[PDB]
Amino acid sequence: SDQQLDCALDLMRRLPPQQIEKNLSDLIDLVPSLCEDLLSSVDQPLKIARDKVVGKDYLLCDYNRDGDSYRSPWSNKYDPPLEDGAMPSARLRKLEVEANNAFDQYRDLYFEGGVSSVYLWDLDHGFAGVILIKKAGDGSKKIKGCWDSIHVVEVQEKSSGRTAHYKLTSTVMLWLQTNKSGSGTMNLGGSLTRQMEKDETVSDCSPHIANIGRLVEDMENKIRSTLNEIYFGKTKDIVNGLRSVDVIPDNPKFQQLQRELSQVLTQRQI
Amino acid sequence: RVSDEEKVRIAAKFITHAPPGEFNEVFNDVRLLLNNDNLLREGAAHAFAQYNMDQFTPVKIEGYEDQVLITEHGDLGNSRFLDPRNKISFKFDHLRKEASDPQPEEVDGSLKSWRESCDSALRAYVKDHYSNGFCTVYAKNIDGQQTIIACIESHQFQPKNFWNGRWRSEWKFTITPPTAQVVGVLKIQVHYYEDGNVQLVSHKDVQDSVTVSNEAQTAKEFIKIIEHAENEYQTAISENYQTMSDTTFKALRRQLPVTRTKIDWNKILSYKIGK
Amino acid sequence: IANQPVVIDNGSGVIKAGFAGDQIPKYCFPNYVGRPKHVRVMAGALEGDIFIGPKAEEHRGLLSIRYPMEHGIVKDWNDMERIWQYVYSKEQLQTFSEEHPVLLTEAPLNPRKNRERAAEVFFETFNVPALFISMQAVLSLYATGRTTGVVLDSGDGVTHAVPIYEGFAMPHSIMRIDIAGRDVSRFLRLYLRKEGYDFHSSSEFEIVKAIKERACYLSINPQKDETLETEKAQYYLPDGSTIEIGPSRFRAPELLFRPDLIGEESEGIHEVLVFAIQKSDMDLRRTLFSNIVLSGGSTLFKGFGDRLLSEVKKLAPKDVKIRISAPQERLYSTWIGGSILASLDTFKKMWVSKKEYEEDGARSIHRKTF
Ligand SMILES: Nc1ncnc2c1ncn2[C@@H]1O[C@H](COP(=O)(O)OP(=O)(O)O)[C@@H](O)[C@H]1O
């Protein structure tokens, strides 16, 4: 059954990432014994939650959730209301409020839409956060699309010197639909994950969350540019290489260029 | 406890919609998942039939020296498929890679003879579009109507590279004098799975009206329609996405902010907005 | 008509020219058209009123300098025609355009309309017998004597990392930016105004290029240089007045690695180099890492190659042998390769003849290049 989990993860890596929720539910139907293993291991699109007391949307993960209920980052309360939920420390809660506010301004500048959520769970040696974002594209347009963040960070605070070992694990779950130009409609689904670790000295001017943020900004600019290329580097060579009309006239030229390069090869040496 | 009938339906959805580079692996993944073989092996055999028809993939029959695509138009109905070029029936085994034990077929083929001249032409143009290209031009009567059904594909699979590009083309040409009617769908699929996944999924539905004149003309007219459509398609598929995806993917999330300055974290944590 | 062919290596900053089968380009001069600002009162003044090359360099202060070509894309076509006419004229080459075949160069992945209009100029206005446009990276490898390897380059207009493996220039793996020496010179000019010493004039713009060429260095750790206070070194201008440069000298060439500082989204030189290696096939990546060739003027900063090596070590997979090689004459790397390519007997087959252009048109030029 360890091979079954390996196959289950291999299957979700090959099926469309647009239908993770439906396929994961069916995969749990087919293997009910792996339900707990698959829900933890298989990454899926983030759920929308609504805080009724504040009147604001928050996002749901395994880390912020304790049992059936999920701590809202705005009110600090779980829905449904649990008696003794796993809350953070009063210092970490104040830090968590400042994280939410900081990453609220983060998202709103990069996307200018959607919803985010930030939750920080208390550790003895550190403070570890999750930064969720979900932005939806223009619904009226034929081109649908969304962008989803799952930045999990682990900060190991050192005792002396005020330095902090950060460990960022960032997933980016994308699905671009393209229905335009009167030539057909294409739907592209991406899912790259990148890891980054760093030790930064703590400043009194800028808190530790700002140090975390700097990793997110740099990671997102790089992951995005990496993603961007893995799209083209494959959608270009593979599709063009299959059905290129200019392949057959250039093949005759390449064969001429093969004689030519061979003549160049001898002449370059001497 | 999930019922045995529920297990087969879950297996069917994955096998019916699997990426063709790894679909035979997906079947192996479904089989390596559920313990017993017979329940999936029996259910997959039906799925493979429907699945291998929608791929337009050719099984090489041992002694033909060419590749005959398989579809709904070649389906005789008795688990054997037509090869309209070489004009022999073949039984296609769906688990195993090969199709063997063929049977010579003989039909009057009056509608079928006309299109086989147009077919042998199409091939030469398929060879022009792709480095490796295989086809099948089915000849059939559909509820009294007279219809050529050319199909083209391309399979480019490599295990080490982790990328797989696959083309399938569906083309139906109904013969009616003078004016004829055409219906065709054109699907691309590419999949990259290194350090995480990326998929290209596509199609173009085209409705066209053609007029029959000569055998040389009808052979070179339909091909011309395909040539221009598939180029315009690839052109748009390559040239729009390299630029427009970059801008639409950017319209969702921008590479830098509206200021074009990396956001200052010190600014965020000690500034107030509004009124 | 197979005379000794001419190699006009184009470029936004500098334009090289000369004959085939030569060691160095004899005719190098900056690619711009100087025109007189002031009113010519006195008789017996500078005649012509359109200055190109060494006359324009000699008489900077009179002339309002303007560049015809930005980011490997000509804006003013009349200016480039005058430059090409000056190249062929008696003041530089001492030849006719009708005699010799032409080898042109351009940056990769440019607009095709500019390539067509370039060919129109060579075939119609000049009466060229045969034309051939080529890549810069392909030539630079022919100059060195290798076939395999990536070519990172940095001129005044374009920075592009082209991977090649045994005479197979992958058109798809070519990365490119519109960020280069001109943008670094513009960013240094902006920093000098923040320091105090403002330069706004077009003749005065070339003093900023001269300061950028001479007094600049790329630090390995930029955060460490930001924390430390600079020494504020001096430099004498063409006039005589001294200028304390300050922290502008080291923060100016950071634009190439951090493109966010000017205010435009791009990858960067070090990212582009990693990105060109990644887009190619898995088996060819380790050979591409081992052979990395440098070229252009904006690779000549102090500690540039050392910073590139550190950036590759950070991004690339671990336990891989990195080697960023470079020639002695980095400025004339592309032209030497063209002179070698032109001297070869194969060159006759590749070119676009004037008869072939008159028959077909632009389609034949698009086919022969790729
Ligand atoms: N020693 C140097 N240090 C820094 N920058 C230089 C140096 N020499 C030249 N440059 C810059 O590089 C440019 C010349 O590059 P070049 O490769 O000739 O451009 P192109 O590729 O367009 O011909 C000049 O415009 C100048 O700004």
Swiss-Prot record, chain B:
Homology family: Belongs to the F-actin-capping protein alpha subunit family.
Modified residue annotations for Phosphoserine: 3
Keywords, ordered alphabetically: Acetylation, Actin capping, Actin-binding, Cytoplasm, Cytoskeleton, Phosphoprotein
A Pfam family that the UniProt record links to this protein: F-actin_cap_A
Gene3D superfamilies listed in its UniProt record: F-actin capping protein, alpha subunit, F-actin capping protein, beta subunit
PROSITE patterns given in the database record: F_ACTIN_CAPPING_A_1 (PS00748), F_ACTIN_CAPPING_A_2 (PS00749)
In-chain residues carrying the UniProt-annotated modification N6-acetyllysine: 13, 91
Biological-process GO terms, alphabetical: actin cytoskeleton organization; barbed-end actin filament capping
Subunit structure comment from the entry: Component of the F-actin capping complex, composed of a heterodimer of an alpha and a beta subunit. Subunit of dynactin, a multiprotein complex part of a tripartite complex with dynein and a adapter, such as BICDL1, BICD2 or HOOK3. The dynactin complex is built around ACTR1A/ACTB filament and consists of an actin-related filament composed of a shoulder domain, a pointed end and a barbed end. Its length is defined by its flexible shoulder domain. The soulder is composed of 2 DCTN1 subunits, 4 DCTN2 and 2 DCTN3.
Compartmental location: Cytoplasm, Cytoskeleton
Gene: CAPZA1
The keyword Cytoplasm belongs to this UniProt entry's keyword annotation: yes
Lineage, top ranks: Eukaryota, Metazoa, Chordata, Craniata, Vertebrata
GO cellular component terms, semicolon-separated: cortical cytoskeleton; F-actin capping protein complex
Name the record gives this protein: F-actin-capping protein subunit alpha-1
Swiss-Prot record, chain C:
Primary location class: cytoplasm
GO cellular component, one term: cell cortex
Source taxon at top rank: Eukaryota
Compartment list: Cytoplasm, Cytoskeleton; Cytoplasm, Cytoskeleton, Microtubule organizing center, Centrosome; Cytoplasm, Cell cortex
Keywords, in A-Z order: Acetylation, ATP-binding, Cytoplasm, Cytoskeleton, Nucleotide-binding
Keyword Nucleotide-binding part of the UniProt annotation: yes
Molecular function as annotated in GO: ATP binding
Signal peptide: none
Subunit and partners: Part of the ACTR1A/ACTB filament around which the dynactin complex is built. The filament contains 8 copies of ACTR1A and 1 ACTB. Interacts with dynein and adapters such as BICD2. Interacts with BCCIP (isoform 2/alpha).
UniProt record similarity statement: Belongs to the actin family. ARP1 subfamily.
PANTHER family for the chain: ACTIN (PTHR11937)
Function, as annotated: Part of the ACTR1A/ACTB filament around which the dynactin complex is built. The dynactin multiprotein complex activates the molecular motor dynein for ultra-processive transport along microtubules.
Protein name: Alpha-centractin
Organism: Sus scrofa (Pig)
